[PDB]
Amino acid sequence: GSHMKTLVIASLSGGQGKTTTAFFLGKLLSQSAKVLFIDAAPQSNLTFFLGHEVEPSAPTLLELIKDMVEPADAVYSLANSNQFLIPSDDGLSNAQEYLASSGMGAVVLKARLKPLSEYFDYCIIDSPPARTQISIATIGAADQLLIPAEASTKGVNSLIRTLEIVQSLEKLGAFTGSILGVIPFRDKWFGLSQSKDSAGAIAAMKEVAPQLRIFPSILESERYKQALNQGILLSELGYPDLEKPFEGVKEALGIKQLVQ
Amino acid sequence: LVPRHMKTLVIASLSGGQGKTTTAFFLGKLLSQSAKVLFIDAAPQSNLTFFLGHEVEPSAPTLLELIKDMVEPADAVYSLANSNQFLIPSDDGLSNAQEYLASSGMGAVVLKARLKPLSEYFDYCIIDSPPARTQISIATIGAADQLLIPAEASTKGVNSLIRTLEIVQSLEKLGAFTGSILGVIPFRDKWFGLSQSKDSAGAIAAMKEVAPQLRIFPSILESERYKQALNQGILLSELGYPDLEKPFEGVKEALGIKQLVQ
Ligand SMILES: Nc1ncnc2c1ncn2[C@@H]1O[C@H](COP(=O)(O)OP(=O)(O)OP(=O)(O)O)[C@@H](O)[C@H]1O
Ligand SMILES: Nc1ncnc2c1ncn2[C@@H]1O[C@H](COP(=O)(O)OP(=O)(O)OP(=O)(O)O)[C@@H](O)[C@H]1O
Ligand SMILES: [Mg+2]
Ligand SMILES: [Mg+2]
């Protein structure tokens, strides 16, 4: 009955908030929808944060990409009944050349996930940094692309370079989705006033890509890691305001909040 | 640029946002107070080049052309504002080197080879690596006389240390890495006065468990001052926070004790 929408979190620079976004957005979406998390990063941060351990001979994203197992076999249930995961471990960097060797790497993951379409409402994919076969393949898989970008000059560059890869993949017919928007990351506020550098970076993001939605920022705050470490939502920790970047995305997806 | 025994220090950490560029910046500037320093920005995202105040002009040779042997190494070296600091810059096109290095069959030793002609020009070469296991991050490790691994004081950082060491071991076995590991710099270690955050403490203890043989330098503390000093293009000591510079003073003292003796 489902028509799975694949949301890919991409940003080529390191530490731009990709995994933090995948974790919170995915948990939030799972409140009323069936969500398939995919950890596409060889460093395997999301797999760990979602509380999943990979047993020695257990099929991961690697085995799926290499078509060594059926898609449903690399899918594991999580604590929550609306949450599932295709995990990764450090061996995933081996997919790097499998993808290169195919000559169609950018559409391999896209192809591998199609059979899971009617089992889930959303697929959320956490991408690694750097331009590689894996980060290109996650982008190729996207129905909707989300780019977290640090609210700094580094983040603006990440936005720009990420958009360049999408534009190139679109030309070659691998990217057929749309760009949902940009989430500024580590936007620094001093009480009620925004830091000039953060404000300036976001303003620069809008100049770079005038057509893109800029979502509410992931504010510079230790509360995100606090909630993450406890396995809970920012709202559940008592900081609903910090959750608004993700609520904004959810609203953009046309998802209507539950009401009382 | 005139010749006058260069030691190549490579900053490597496979995970994103581990303090590589921050370390390269502050360490290089600190060392340049008493040595001639060549920065190399080996990251396609080109953060270090920007932070050092360099703009790459339309047709200017950069690290890409050096890696591809299209220019003499000295032709890709640019002077910076400080007369003891120099830079081989990068720009977005540097990703093209991934191809070239792969096709050589010996990428891990290519950068190492390209830099030898500069041996008698500089005292230190400081190379900022990109994240992720790629031909470029492998080639920077191969070029190292001394390797420094900044690693976030978190489970993520511990994993970066673990995986970075795996790449180093592989390259050591194959004869590409012939240097030594100078040590680990914990990054974004959270302290409030004398109270260290439980997660930071736990991660740093795990790093020592992973690599008991390695020197752990003083931490780069979680602090907005680091961002401020970077944005202004100055040292932390110059900003008026010399104590935040302890990690790099620690490295400098470790390199100084390695000074040849009779
Ligand atoms: N002491 C500090 N406290 C908090 N944030 C810091 C500190 N030092 C640097 N940062 C910021 O943390 C982020 C990561 O640092 P940096 O860019 O040096 O990591 P990196 O390993 O070079 O990242 P990449 O993998 O993208 O190359 C940057 O936004 C940087 O400005
Ligand atoms: N709101 C916040 N303020 C400050 N730091 C944060 C915030 N949210 C997350 N962080 C921290 O910033 C760092 C980078 O975040 P994260 O790992 O999500 O980025 P990433 O893009 O997934 O990195 P990588 O490129 O390594 O995959 C992590 O230490 C994370 O815990
Ligand atoms: Mg990540
Ligand atoms: Mg960097």
Q: Which CATH number fits the domain that encloses residue A118?
A: 3.40.50.300
| Ligand 1: residue whose CA is nearest its atom 26 | A14
User: Can you read off the two tokens belonging to residue A80?
Assistant: 């929550």
DSSP B58: T
- The residue with tokens 């240097």 is B179
Query: What letters, b where the CB count within 10 A reaches 16 and e where it falls short, cover B206-236?
Result: bbeebbeebebbbbbbbbeebbebbeebebb
Cα B209 to Cα B184: distance, rounded to the nearest angstrom: 13
Q: Do A225 and B18 touch (CB under 8 A)?
A: no
The residue range of the domain holding B239 is 7-257
Q: Would the CB atoms of A157 and B190 count as touching at under 8 Å?
A: no
Q: Which residues in chain A are contacts of B50 at CB distance < 8 A?
A: 153, 157
Distance from C-alpha of B29 to C-alpha of B35, rounded to nearest angstrom:
10
Asked whether residue B2 is domain-assigned, the answer is no
Provide the β-strand partners of residue A145. A8, A179
Give chain A positions within 8 Å (CB) of B16: 13-16, 18, 43, 128-130
Compute CA distances B120 → A62, B6, B36, B70, whole Å.
Answer: 46, 6, 11, 21
Say how many Å lie between the CA of residue B19 and the centre of ligand 4.
7
- Can you list the pairs that B239-247 forms with residues at least 24 positions away whose Cβ atoms lie under 8 Å? B245/B26, B245/B30, B246/B218, B247/B23, B247/B26, B247/B185, B247/B217, B247/B218, B247/B219, B247/B220
CA separation for the pair A160, A139 (Å, rounded): 15
Distance CA A149, CA A158 (A): 6
Instruction: Examine residue A56 and state whether it is found in any structural domain, yes or no.
Output: yes
Closest CA to A88 of A120, A116, A53: A53
Residue A79, token pair as written in the block: 């604590």
- Using the 8-state DSSP alphabet, how is residue A45 labeled? H
- For chain A, which residues lie within 8 Å of any Cβ of chain B, measuring from their own Cβ? 12-16, 18, 42-45, 48, 90, 93, 96, 128-132, 152-154, 157-158, 161, 164, 188, 197, 222, 225, 229
| Other beta carbons less than 10 A from residue A193's beta carbon | 8
Q: How far apart are CA B54 and CA B230, in angstroms?
A: 14
**What are the Cα distances from residue B52, in Å, to B26, B85, B123, B204?**
10, 9, 19, 30
Distance CA B103, CA B159 (A): 30
Both structure tokens of A31: 């409140």
Pocket lining: B15 vs ligand 2, CB cutoff 6 Å: yes
- B190-196 long-range contacts (CB < 8 A, ≥24 apart) are B190/A222, B190/B153, B190/B221, B190/B222, B191/B221, B191/B222
What is the radius of gyration, based on Cα positions, of chain B? 17
Q: What is the DSSP letter of B251?
A: H
**Type of residue found at B153:** A
Q: Is residue B1 part of a domain?
A: no
Chain A: closest CA distance from residue B216 (Å): 22
Residue A68 neighbours by CB under 8 Å, 6+ apart: A59, A62
> By the 8 A CB rule, do B48 and B76 touch?
no
Q: How many Cα atoms occupy the beta-carbon half-sphere of A177 within 13 Å? A: 22
Fill in the DSSP letter of residue A191.
Answer: T
Residue with tokens 């560029």: B21
A185 lies in some domain = yes
CA A183 distance to own-chain centroid: 11
Q: How far apart are CA A239 and CA A93, in angstroms?
A: 36
Q: Give the CA distances from residue B42 to residues A106, B125, B183, B252, in Å, rounded to whole numbers and listed in that order.
A: 25, 12, 20, 22
Phi and psi angles of residue B200, each rounded to the nearest 5 degrees, phi first: -65, -45
Single-letter amino acid code for the residue at B95: S
Range B172-176 contact pairs with CB under 8 angstroms and sequence separation of 24 or more: B174/B108, B176/B108, B176/B109, B176/B112, B176/B138, B176/B141, B176/B142
CA A198, CA B252: separation in Å to the nearest integer? 33
What phi, psi does A124 have (nearest 5°)? -115, 120
Cβ–Cβ < 8 Å for B118, B6: yes
- Number of Cβ within 10 Å of residue A206's Cβ equals 12
Whether A88 lines ligand 2, by a CB cut-off of 6 Å, is: no
Task: Write the residues followed by a gap in chain B (C–N more than 2.5 A).
Answer: 4
Residue B116 tokens read as 């030898």
Cβ-in-10-Å burial (0-12, 13-18, 19+) of A99 comes to buried
Domain annotation covers residue A105: yes
Q: How was this structure determined?
A: X-ray
Interatomic CA distance for residues B253 and B126, integer angstroms: 16
Cα separation, A181 vs A139, whole angstroms: 14
State the binding site of B for ATP: 16-22, 45, 152, 156, 187-188, 221-223, 226
Domain membership flag for residue B163: yes
Distance in angstroms (rounded) separating the CA atoms of residues B89 and B47? 10
What letter represents residue A161's amino acid? R
Residue type, A189: W
Residue B154 structure tokens: 């978190």
Q: Who contacts A74 (Cβ-Cβ below 8 Å, separation ≥6)?
A: A59, A60, A61, A63, A64, A86, A87
Of B47, B134, B159, the CB nearest to A130: B134
The kind and range of the H/E element at B62 are none
Gap between the Cα atoms of A158 and B199, Å rounded = 28
Query: Residue B82's CB: how many other CB atoms inside 10 A?
Result: 15
**Has residue A242 been placed in a domain?**
yes
Beta bridge partners of A54: none
AA identity, residue B96: N
Number of domains in chain A: 1
Residues present in chain B in total? 262
Handedness of CA A88, A92, A95, A96 (dihedral sign): positive
* Interface with A, mutate which of B20, B52, B156, B223 (most A CBs under 10 A): B156
C-beta of residue B37 within 8 angstroms of C-beta of residue A153: no
Going by C-alpha positions, the residue among A200, A110, A192, A115 that lies closest to residue A150 is A200
With residue A210 as reference, give the H or E element that holds it.
none
- Best interface-test mutation with B: which of A9, A11, A12 has the largest number of B CBs within 10 A? A12
Listed in sequence order, the DSSP H helices in chain B are 20-31, 47-51, 63-67, 96-104, 110-115, 135-142, 155-173, 198-210, 224-232, 236-239, 246-256
